[PDB]
Amino acid sequence: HWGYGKHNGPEHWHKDFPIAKGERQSPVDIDTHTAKYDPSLKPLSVSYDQATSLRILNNGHAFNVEFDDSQDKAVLKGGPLDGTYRLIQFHFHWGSLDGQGSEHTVDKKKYAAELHLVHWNTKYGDFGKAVQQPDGLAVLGIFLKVGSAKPGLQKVVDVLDSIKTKGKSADFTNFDPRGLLPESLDYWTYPGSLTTPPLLECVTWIVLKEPISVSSEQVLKFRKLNFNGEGEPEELMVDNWRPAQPLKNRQIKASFK
Numbered sequence: 001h002w003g004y005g006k007h008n009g010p011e012h013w014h015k016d017f018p019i020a021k022g023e024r025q026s027p028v029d030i031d032t033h034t035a036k037y038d039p040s041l042k043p044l045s046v047s048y049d050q051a052t053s054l055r056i057l058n059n060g061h062a063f064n065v066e067f068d069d070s071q072d073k074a075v076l077k078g079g080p081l082d083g084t085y086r087l088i089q090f091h092f093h094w095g096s097l098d099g100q101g102s103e104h105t106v107d108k109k110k111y112a113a114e115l116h117l118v119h120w121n122t123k124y125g126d127f128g129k130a131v132q133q134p135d136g137l138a139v140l141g142i143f144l145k146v147g148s149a150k151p152g153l154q155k156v157v158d159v160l161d162s163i164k165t166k167g168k169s170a171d172f173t174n175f176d177p178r179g180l181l182p183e184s185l186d187y188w189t190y191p192g193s194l195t196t197p198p199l200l201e202c203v204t205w206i207v208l209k210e211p212i213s214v215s216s217e218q219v220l221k222f223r224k225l226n227f228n229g230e231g232e233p234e235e236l237m238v239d240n241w242r243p244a245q246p247l248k249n250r251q252i253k254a255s256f257k
């Protein structure tokens with residue numbers, strides 16, 4: 001099974017998922033001096049007021065906070081997007097040390113972690129059909145740096161003890177994703193892919209420039225999770241990030257000047 005170790009990590013993914021060496025793979029390094037401000041971009045709209053979380057799950061590579069997407073409750077639109085994208089789940093990527101963990105990098109800078117809010121284009125009916133389209137998904141990426149604690153994240157942190165191992169899930173209702181957002185919505189955008197197998201190239205990436213700060217204690221809690229299942233040798237869930245991939249024939253647009 002794919003993972004982040006030496007024998008099943010990112011360098012091995014292309015074997016089971018050839019698209020790993022595709023033309024629009026993510027993450028990528030965001031070179032701020034090559035990214036161009038795009039006037040055609042409309043303001044970004046993040047509407048999470050009616051978000052309805054359902055459960056939190058440890059899938060062996062990260063933990064997913066799932067949402068009820070049977071209705072337009074939590075949506076993303078505007079910016080580089082055409083139409084409406086519904087929030088289906090969010091998760092993080094983090095390191096074993098504060099100096100690494102993010103997937104996208106800014107001028108080669110690696111953040112301690114990165115949050116990915118995954119949304120699917122409503123014109124496709126469901127997530128399954130959406131990931132069969134070039135504009136099927138929109139992922140809002142938010143960098144995490146270690147400093148002050150993030151209050152809106154503590155609820156996630158305190159439930160991790162109940163889903164320490166692969167396969168474990170816990171009721172995670174009434175979680176407000178708005179508490180994970182930074183002040184500014186300035187962002188960089190480019191066409192990309194999911195950063196975990198199957199690495200589908202259906203994502204319009206919207207990476208926020210402003211990182212959120214989380215405490216050392218909070219990230220340390222992330223690092224207590226296990227990649228392994230209950231009863232198996234303990235392998236700490238850390239460094240579950242894919243490195244920057246070739247930008248190839250792509251242009252990163254900045255929503256700001």
Ligand SMILES: N[C@@H](Cc1ccccc1)C(=O)O
Binds near residue numbers: 059064196197198
């Ligand atoms: N390997 C997982 C990858 C995944 C991660 C997160 C959400 C959905 C899927 C799969 O069965 O999907």
Ligand SMILES: [Hg+2]
Binds near residue numbers: 131132133136200202
């Ligand atoms: Hg696609």
Ligand SMILES: [Zn+2]
Binds near residue numbers: 093116195
């Ligand atoms: Zn991700």
